[PDB]
Amino acid sequence: PRGSNVAGLFNNCVACFEYVQLGRHFGRDYERCQLRLDIAKARLSRWGEAVKINDDPRFHSDAPTDKSVQLAKSIVEEILLLFESAQKTSKRYELVADQQDLVVFEDKDMKPIGRALHRRLNDLVSRRQKKTAWALYDGKSLEKIVDQVARFVDELEKAFPIEAVCHKLAEIEIEEVEDEASLTILKDAAGGIDAAMSDAAAQKIDA
Amino acid sequence: GSNVAGLFNNCVACFEYVQLGRHFGRDYERCQLRLDIAKARLSRWGEAVKINDDPRFHSDAPTDKSVQLAKSIVEEILLLFESAQKTSKRYELVADQQDLVVFEDKDMKPIGRALHRRLNDLVSRRQKQTSLAKKTAWALYDGKSLEKIVDQVARFVDELEKAFPIEAVCHKLAEIEIEEVEDEASLTILKDAAGGIDAAMSDAAAQKIDA
């Protein structure tokens, strides 16, 4: 029975985002809430790239030696419990909701600028990453996932000597986005979740 | 085990393994009472609903919407405590021995220590018999971890109380909990500490100190 490791759990955490839909009560806020999730996911995938998660055998063992890797193992476990909690919360709502409320947005409900950005952010992570849909029905559950994953990645970044590397990665994620309207959107949406992306974008808009 | 009563009794028992770390400072006593009150309010619910006697709560695959709802809520309270312990463990792994020292109820004033013991006793009296099996004791090392538990448990017990017809029953129960506490000092403390977490206890204390 071959036990769990940091890379495996980490790949799981990234994949949890793929399955999330946003319910009708997001309303006009759908577009930016979806981008906040994409950014939370961008930031998590960046950490893996920065620590070279797929090459370093330390993230592939059941019983890691380093405190740092042991810390990462716990954090990634805790991200998974976060998504498991949200999944239960969604299921309790679906148990009780009428049909009109069990409706979700799709990215075609985003303006062309947010949708291009949504797809860029999603492609960016699938480029790095060598179950069943479910919905977030209220803003509070989404903010919990965004804020807590930001917090978790804060401490994932703290445990490793990778800050210069994370800033470099964030700067080259943004090289493909050239237009001021889009750079502005990322600057806004990376607000309080991905300071490295926000700063990379702010730098571009004003130079 | 995995019926609602078994998961519920596990939730109440989660509170017993929790220590508060050095960094609570002079807020130790109040934060500990806030935890005991959340535990008292969760256990009040099990009593109100007759959790240990009602067979709906003893099946692994309940059909009733309200009982399916309680099972999810109780599983989510469990996840809540599982998360806090991973957070605590991450602190332990990196801290110095100075920072690993925990408060004990001897660090409360006699008034708070009596409330702590009374609130604990009241739940002990209600809980289903348990074996002697222990989980590892673990500490909350920051204020925000404590607030996260207290606040989320209060919201979860709001959800639990919403799914069952027990409004008047919970009020009577909180009145009975508070009948042995005679002194205005201790009652003001419960009135205040129950604020935001247990309105039934808050109101019961208020009704008693005004009488």
Side-chain angles (χ1 to χ4, degrees), chain A residues 1-61 63-207, chain B residues 1-59 61-211:
Chain A
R2 318 179 162 169
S4 61
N5 47 248
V6 177
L9 301 166
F10 171 84
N11 287 333
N12 244 248
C13 296
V14 180
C16 282
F17 286 95
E18 268 89 313
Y19 292 129
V20 59
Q21 303 179 115
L22 305 197
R24 59 166 308 250
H25 283 100
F26 285 89
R28 68 197 315 262
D29 295 316
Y30 161 63
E31 190 177 319
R32 85 148 227 149
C33 291
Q34 177 67 56
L35 296 165
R36 282 185 83 74
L37 250 20
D38 300 330
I39 291 155
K41 193 197 183 175
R43 192 172 163 214
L44 187 51
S45 80
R46 185 189 303 147
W47 176 84
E49 188 87 312
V51 301
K52 257 74 194 306
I53 197 150
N54 300 135
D55 313 322
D56 182 353
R58 227 138 104 277
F59 303 109
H60 296 264
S61 78
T65 270
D66 253 68
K67 279 210 213 299
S68 273
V69 183
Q70 284 171 212
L71 268 7
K73 165 101 161 151
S74 183
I75 297 155
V76 120
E77 294 181 326
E78 225 192 305
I79 294 169
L80 260 9
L81 261 12
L82 182 74
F83 279 104
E84 181 181 359
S85 299
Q87 268 158 49
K88 293 196 174 287
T89 294
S90 157
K91 273 158 66 216
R92 290 195 303 277
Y93 180 77
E94 287 173 355
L95 222 28
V96 142
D98 33 57
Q99 256 46 57
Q100 76 195 11
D101 292 315
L102 301 161
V103 169
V104 294
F105 286 97
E106 309 159 86
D107 81 353
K108 68 175 184 72
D109 298 311
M110 288 183 208
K111 289 146 44 235
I113 181 141
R115 176 157 24 128
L117 228 32
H118 172 71
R119 303 184 174 162
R120 200 157 259 100
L121 262 5
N122 289 158
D123 290 4
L124 162 187
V125 5
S126 64
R127 253 72 183 183
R128 295 167 163 156
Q129 304 296 303
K130 97 168 206 295
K131 301 292 214 312
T132 30
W134 63 279
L136 289 166
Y137 290 103
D138 73 325
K140 280 291 218 301
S141 300
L142 167 324
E143 288 271 22
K144 176 160 182 196
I145 294 189
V146 160
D147 292 359
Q148 287 227 234
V149 167
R151 269 16 94 199
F152 287 130
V153 189
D154 289 350
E155 79 183 290
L156 234 23
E157 290 176 7
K158 291 199 206 85
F160 291 82
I162 62 170
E163 126 143 283
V165 188
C166 290
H167 267 282
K168 183 277 306 268
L169 254 12
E171 282 169 38
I172 60 182
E173 288 163 17
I174 256 52
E175 63 166 82
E176 35 172 28
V177 24
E178 296 167 40
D179 61 300
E180 177 254 308
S182 308
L183 282 163
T184 286
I185 285 155
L186 288 167
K187 193 192 163 194
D188 177 282
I193 56 185
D194 194 359
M197 184 194 288
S198 187
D199 283 355
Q203 288 180 74
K204 249 191 150 176
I205 72 147
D206 284 336
Chain B
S2 188
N3 48 243
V4 181
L7 297 163
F8 173 85
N9 292 317
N10 294 341
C11 289
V12 176
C14 280
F15 287 95
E16 282 153 26
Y17 306 100
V18 19
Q19 295 162 171
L20 299 189
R22 139 216 258 263
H23 273 78
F24 287 91
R26 344 131 303 155
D27 286 345
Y28 162 56
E29 190 183 305
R30 182 201 126 72
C31 287
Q32 179 62 66
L33 294 169
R34 304 268 296 175
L35 241 23
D36 302 335
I37 290 160
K39 180 192 209 190
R41 193 204 162 189
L42 176 61
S43 90
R44 198 185 307 123
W45 179 85
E47 185 72 2
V49 107
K50 306 185 151 66
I51 185 86
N52 287 142
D53 303 321
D54 184 347
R56 272 178 320 169
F57 303 121
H58 291 71
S59 50
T63 52
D64 209 286
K65 280 222 186 288
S66 298
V67 180
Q68 295 181 161
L69 274 54
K71 186 173 189 260
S72 190
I73 284 152
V74 109
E75 284 163 345
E76 222 182 317
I77 294 162
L78 262 15
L79 262 22
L80 190 51
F81 279 104
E82 204 190 344
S83 301
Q85 182 151 18
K86 294 177 174 296
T87 301
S88 170
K89 263 164 46 279
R90 283 199 309 277
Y91 188 90
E92 276 170 46
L93 191 56
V94 95
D96 322 301
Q97 306 311 306
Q98 35 162 39
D99 298 313
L100 295 184
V101 170
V102 302
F103 284 105
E104 31 217 304
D105 78 6
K106 80 163 84 83
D107 299 306
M108 291 177 185
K109 306 199 153 194
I111 196 180
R113 174 194 315 112
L115 246 18
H116 173 68
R117 290 155 177 195
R118 166 165 275 101
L119 258 17
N120 283 187
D121 282 353
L122 144 186
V123 356
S124 287
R125 282 191 192 102
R126 287 176 175 154
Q127 294 313 288
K128 195 201 180 194
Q129 200 170 177
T130 32
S131 73
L132 294 190
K134 269 194 209 58
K135 268 142 91 271
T136 61
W138 63 277
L140 296 171
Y141 294 109
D142 59 284
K144 316 299 104 220
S145 292
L146 179 302
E147 290 308 335
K148 188 142 97 216
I149 294 187
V150 159
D151 295 355
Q152 293 219 228
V153 172
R155 300 330 134 210
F156 283 134
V157 180
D158 290 349
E159 265 193 289
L160 250 15
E161 287 169 16
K162 215 274 166 63
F164 297 85
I166 60 171
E167 217 215 296
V169 168
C170 290
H171 285 316
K172 275 191 109 309
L173 253 9
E175 283 176 5
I176 296 165
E177 297 174 0
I178 233 135
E179 57 164 283
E180 203 131 11
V181 55
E182 297 306 355
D183 52 315
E184 203 273 289
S186 294
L187 293 159
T188 312
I189 287 176
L190 295 175
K191 194 201 168 185
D192 288 342
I197 69 192
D198 189 344
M201 181 177 311
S202 194
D203 295 348
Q207 273 154 347
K208 192 161 180 156
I209 46 193
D210 289 302

